[PDB]
């Protein structure tokens, strides 16, 4: 939340002139905030756009902040925790599957949340398992 | 088999037909053998002798009664059935081999001679001078029985394949 401002001359809005001319469609792509309107975002001062200027080197140096090391790329997940996660997700998915059976039967008889939850849970299980399994094989080959 | 309606029945036919069946058995072409048997009419399999004999030989050879196969040598409907009996003995020896090297542990010299109906004992060395199942250990007929590492690369291929078909848009 950064906003830039500049004033309006006392003989500008009282002499019958708009505060700031408009020759390009650029100055109307950002909407003002009621917080500033109340205090007069358009009675005593402007609001100039920001448009941050980023080189190509600063962006890389900042990417280094969370850049993950090759270690984190190639390191396995604690197998105990992984198995516990598999088990918990498969149980929750079983519950959602029972609810899904009930829902499909009910809807087909009388003429969703279970399906969507089941889809997200299948996604998480498959991504976790495939990632860890491939990391395991890669290590078994690379470190011997 | 083709010009059946026009052609008159040729009593001098089953001889060559069964001799062909014998030839197929001789060159171990069991698939073609049974295809031609199917082509033949049903009754001839059980009535005629010229065809029954090759049928009998194949049936015995598939059962495994190689002793009956050998004993059938004297029983030949016509002397024309010759030189294919000999190629059939050779092929039978090859099949007996197949058995021996696929599923045994070790056969000594005397027992090899007893089982494989080799030529005279002096040439009994035959089929070891020819096939040579790495023979030699201890007794020359030790038969050298012709009977654990993660396949990481192949498993990686398959798992990457799962990922590929799961992430590709379709």
UniProtKB/Swiss-Prot annotation, chain A:
Residue positions of the PTM Phosphoserine? 69
Phosphothreonine modification sites are 111
The free-text tissue note of the record is: Widely expressed. Highest levels in heart and skeletal muscle.
Name the family the entry cites.
Belongs to the peptidase M67A family. PSMD14 subfamily.
Q: What subunit structure does UniProt give?
A: Component of the 19S proteasome regulatory particle complex. The 26S proteasome consists of a 20S core particle (CP) and two 19S regulatory subunits (RP). The regulatory particle is made of a lid composed of 9 subunits including PSMD4, a base containing 6 ATPases and few additional components. Within the complex, PSMD4 interacts with subunit PSMD7 through their respective MPN domain. Interacts with TXNL1.
> What is the annotated role of this protein in its UniProt record?
Component of the 26S proteasome, a multiprotein complex involved in the ATP-dependent degradation of ubiquitinated proteins. This complex plays a key role in the maintenance of protein homeostasis by removing misfolded or damaged proteins, which could impair cellular functions, and by removing proteins whose functions are no longer required. Therefore, the proteasome participates in numerous cellular processes, including cell cycle progression, apoptosis, or DNA damage repair.
What is the protein name given in its UniProt record?
26S proteasome non-ATPase regulatory subunit 14
Q: From which organism does this entry originate?
A: Homo sapiens (Human)
**The encoding gene:** PSMD14
From Swiss-Prot, chain B:
Q: Where is the PCI domain?
A: 1-151
Q: Annotated cross-link Glycyl lysine isopeptide (Lys-Gly) (interchain with G-Cter in SUMO2) - which positions?
A: 122
Q: Which family does it belong to?
A: Belongs to the proteasome subunit S14 family.
Q: How does it assemble?
A: Component of the 19S proteasome regulatory particle complex. The 26S proteasome consists of a 20S core particle (CP) and two 19S regulatory subunits (RP). The regulatory particle is made of a lid composed of 9 subunits including PSMD8, a base containing 6 ATPases and few additional components. Interacts with DDI2. Interacts with TASOR.
Q: What does this protein do?
A: Component of the 26S proteasome, a multiprotein complex involved in the ATP-dependent degradation of ubiquitinated proteins. This complex plays a key role in the maintenance of protein homeostasis by removing misfolded or damaged proteins, which could impair cellular functions, and by removing proteins whose functions are no longer required. Therefore, the proteasome participates in numerous cellular processes, including cell cycle progression, apoptosis, or DNA damage repair.
Recorded protein name is 26S proteasome non-ATPase regulatory subunit 8
In the complete protein, the residues contained here run 176 to 350 of 350
